[PDB]
Every structure is written in C-alpha cells, then in structure tokens.
Task: structure prediction
Amino acid sequence: NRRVIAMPSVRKYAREKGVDIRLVQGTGKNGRVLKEDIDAWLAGG
Result:
C-alpha cells in the first residue's frame, strides 16, 4: 500500500531531506504535500 501525495518536486525534496510524504500530511489541493510541508516535518514533526 503506497498512497503518497506530493508534488513532483516535493517528493524529491522530502526524498532528499530524508522525509517521506507518508509521514507528512499534505494540505495542498487534495491534501498533497508541499515543500513547505516537508520543511515543517524536519522543522517540528
């Protein structure tokens, strides 16, 4: 089961920041993870 939701650039950003969209609650459009979301994870979580 892999229901990840994140922009084509975000998936790369989180993927780079060691963050996984699975651990992030995207709030974009239909709940898609934004680069801001990724940063928020590492900057809090």
About this structure: The radius of gyration is 9 Å.
